[PDB]
Design a protein around this ligand. Structure first.
Ligand code: PGW
Ligand code: NS2
Ligand code: SOG
Ligand code: SOG
Ligand code: SOG
Ligand code: SOG
Ligand code: SOG
Ligand code: SOG
Ligand code: SOG
Length: 314
């Protein structure tokens, strides 16, 4: 009486809205993140340790936007994998790498700020060390997401059907046992979301208490200027971390409930579940669009470069 899987199989009633949201995010993130790289290239005064990490973040974001976003939209619209076995492993792999790169870049920004502000003369923070750390971030991210690429498999509902069309193919994780996905997704959630964001929250709170706390009696002019500039960057970075945690919260929670707790298997609520996952996928991409916008409103330096770029191209 209520089984209409094919009516929504081709297009969904919210399908156009999803296409518009995806395209809007695609354009904004590509232009904006390119502007983040070009701003840091243009202004030599902005080539700081934090800003070097921020374009690393913009590189990770551009990787996911250019390659993963188009594929994700297609998957969410058609509920089928039309790009073959190799890309079934590559595109989810690149998304996993992009997530790792982003969270570790934010972790290293928080760590730099925390040692710079709360434990000042222990570690030396140079832009050369920052480029070394950026290389390390990619090395780690590329290595640790190989298991994810290994588990991805493209499969059609009826195996001889894959020989005629890709229309009934599906890209998903293939797990030999019930326990392995539970351990894997528990570790994926903790390592790429919970633990780094918990640690970053505590770091930014300590940074906040030092920057907005008890002023040391009789500070110099140069010390108050240092504090004011650090307050500007800290305010922005806390917004970037908060937006990241908000964007990634739905999909992280959803995947945990699905993979660790075995939820959303029930056929009664399929439609609702698919809506939830679809939206969750989108804001992952929405975050890539949001970061340049954040810099425009909270960094006068970034705003200046963006204004100049808009004047040049318009
Ligand atoms: C390796 C892979 C991941 C990548 C990791 C990279 C991440 C790197 C990012 C930032 C580095 C900065 C570290 C932050 C420093 C931690 C700051 C901190 O300890 O928080 C305090 C209290 O909070 C407290 O309730 C302490 C209890 C913590 C609350 C427990 C909730 C779990 C959070 C879940 C997080 C997982 C933890 C991971 C550990 C390995 C603040 O108050 P308060 O000024 O009084 O202190 C006085 C103090 O000097 C005590 O002598
Ligand atoms: C469209 O599906 C997505 C989009 C974003 C995702 N995501 N963003 C942040 C965290 N997870 C996920 C997702 O849950 N996971 C869990 C492990 C593998 C990973 C990262 C994955 N990335 C993908 C990228 C594109 C495509 Cl097309 C598929 C099928 C992907 N699967 C799925
Ligand atoms: C100018 C008026 C246009 C009317 C044409 C409408 C096209 C509907 S086709 C119909 O769509 C369903 C899903 O949308 C599927 O269940 C069926 O397989 C398919 O046959
Ligand atoms: C959405 C952005 C992702 C890029 C998608 C572009 C389509 C690539 S075609 C693809 O090339 C692969 C070569 O290895 C094979 O899997 C198949 O022969 C073929 O179908
Ligand atoms: C060699 C000493 S290093 C120096 O030691 C102090 C205590 O001796 C700490 O308070 C500081 O953090 C640190 O700069
Ligand atoms: C009962 C299920 C219906 C299966 C029949 C669909 C016929 C295949 S059409 C089409 O043939 C093209 C040739 O170029 C390929 O490129 C595509 O993969 C495929 O989509
Ligand atoms: C000695 C170290 C061996 C390292 C090899 C990885 C651990 C194997 S577990 C097993 O691997 C399958 C592949 O067959 C996955 O698809 C399953 O989900 C998973 O349960
Ligand atoms: C070397 C590779 C190791 C991969 C892990 C082994 C796969 C078997 S998991 C299996 O799952 C059940 C719950 O699903 C548990 O009750 C059992 O105790 C356990 O035996
Ligand atoms: C003899 C009775 C048979 C029991 C089989 C043991 C299976 C326990 S797996 C366990 O299931 C939870 C669901 O509540 C998940 O949350 C956990 O992550 C996961 O580790």
């Amino acid at each position: 009486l209520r089984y209409l899987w094919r009516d929504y199989l081709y297009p969904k009633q919210y399908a156009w809205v999803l296409i518009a949201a995806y395209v809007a995010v695609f354009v904004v993130a590509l232009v904006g993140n390119t502007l983040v790289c070009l701003a840091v290239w243009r202004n030599h005064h902005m080539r700081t340790v934090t800003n070097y990490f921020l374009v690393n973040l913009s590189l990770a974001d551009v990787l996911a936007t250019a390659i993963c976003l188009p594929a994700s939209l297609l998957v969410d619209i058609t509920e089928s994998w039309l790009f073959g076995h190799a890309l079934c492993k590559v595109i989810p792999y690149l998304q996993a790498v992009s997530v790792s790169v982003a969270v570790l870049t934010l972790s290293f920004i928080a760590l730099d700020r925390w040692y710079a502000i709360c434990h000042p003369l222990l570690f030396k923070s140079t832009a050369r060390r920052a480029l070394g750390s950026i290389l390390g971030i990619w090395a780690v991210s590329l290595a640790i997401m190989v298991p994810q690429a290994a588990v991805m498999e493209c499969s059609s509902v009826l195996p001889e059907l894959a020989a005629r069309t890709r229309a009934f193919s599906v890209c998903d994780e293939r797990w030999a046992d019930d326990l392995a996905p539970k351990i894997y997704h528990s570790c994926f959630f903790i390592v790429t979301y919970l633990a780094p964001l918990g640690l970053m929250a505590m770091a930014y709170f300590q940074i906040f208490r030092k920057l907005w706390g008890r002023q040391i009696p009789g500070t110099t002019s140069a010390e108050v200027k240092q504090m004011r500039a650090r307050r500007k960057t800290a305010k922005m970075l806390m917004v970037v971390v908060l937006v990241f945690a908000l964007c990634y919260l739905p999909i992280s929670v959803l995947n945990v409930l699905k993979r660790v707790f075995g939820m959303f298997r029930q056929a009664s609520d399929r439609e609702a579940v698919y809506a939830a996952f679809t939206f969750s996928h989108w804001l992952v991409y929405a975050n890539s669009a949001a970061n340049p916008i954040i810099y425009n409103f909270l960094s006068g330096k970034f705003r200046e470069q963006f204004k100049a770029a808009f004047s040049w191209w318009l």
